[PDB]
């Protein structure tokens, strides 16, 4: 929606919400010269 998408925006039911990672997300994190 507006101001930085939604309410529950961007927290995928099958990964974040269950604390599971998809097979390549690492790749992404690792470049932001790494994650959380």
């Amino acid at each position: 929606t507006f101001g930085s998408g939604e309410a529950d925006c961007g927290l995928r039911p099958l990964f974040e919400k269950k604390s599971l990672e998809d097979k390549t997300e690492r790749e992404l994190l690792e470049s932001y010269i790494d994650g959380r």
Binding site: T1, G5, C9, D22, T24, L28, L29, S31
Partner: protein, 252 residues
């Protein structure tokens, strides 16, 4: 997508298929940004030069899809559109400047393990992520090579490329509303979006709040995965205010 893999089940809950009712065909991709709004490229809807002007009851949006052509009987949900809004200043005449449009759904959708909205960036998120070298993720059911079609949603991660490199790579005039992404031939890794892929989301995961943001909309490219060429995408943050306006304007 060229040179990517098949996405995992529910890996892109915000991935929307723009589908032509008759002939029943995939037009483009799209992203779910709330339960009543979807975001896609304006060239998916209007391209006067090839005589393309899709109207509201010309289309359906399909969400929760994984399979390209199968009807995913109790997984995907199909919706009718209520309105189509193109950026009043989309340049179809020279460079596809402001290739962005919003479709407000005839009824809100219900979220599910397969259907979830993506976040739109805030000046600060946009500001710390949209940096060359940083990787984003594209998805779509489009062409597998420049010149088949996938059975499943595909995905590829690409690095954000420095503007000057961007420019230096084409003869099209590039505006601040655009960014390019792909690997350099020196780098020895590939992948790119391709026809059929347009309107899809380009997204990053915040390392601050672990959330997924849509940074880019799949816009145009000189051939798919050509060495020394890069995909181009509409710059979703540069356009948030426009997006903020119509939603406020006649939104959910």
């Amino acid at each position: 997508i060229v040179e990517g893999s098949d996405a995992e089940i529910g890996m892109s809950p915000w991935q929307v298929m723009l589908f032509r009712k008759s002939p029943q065909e995939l037009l483009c991709g799209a992203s779910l940004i709330s339960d009543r709004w979807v975001l896609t490229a304006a060239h998916c809807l209007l391209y006067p030069p090839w005589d393309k002007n899709f109207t509201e009851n010309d289309l359906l949006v399909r969400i929760g899809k994984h399979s390209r052509t199968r009807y995913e009987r109790n997984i995907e949900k199909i919706s009718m559109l209520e309105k189509i809004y193109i950026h009043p200043r989309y340049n179809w005449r020279e460079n596809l400047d402001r290739d962005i449009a919003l479709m407000k759904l005839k009824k809100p959708v219900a979220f599910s393990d397969y259907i979830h909205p993506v976040c739109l960036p805030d000046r600060e998120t946009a500001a710390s992520l949209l940096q060359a070298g940083y990787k984003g993720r594209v998805t779509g059911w489009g062409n597998l090579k420049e010149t088949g079609q996938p059975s499943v949603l595909q995905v590829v991660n690409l690095p954000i490329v420095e503007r000057p490199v961007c420019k230096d790579s084409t003869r099209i005039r590039i505006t601040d509303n655009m960014f390019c992404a792909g690997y350099k031939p020196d780098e020895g890794k590939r992948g790119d979006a391709c026809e059929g892929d347009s309107g899809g989301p380009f997204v990053m995961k915040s390392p601050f709040n672990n959330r997924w943001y849509q940074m880019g909309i799949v816009s145009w490219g000189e051939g798919c995965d050509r060495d020394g060429k890069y995909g181009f995408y509409t710059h979703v943050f540069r356009l948030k205010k426009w997006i903020q306006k119509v939603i406020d304007q006649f939104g959910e």
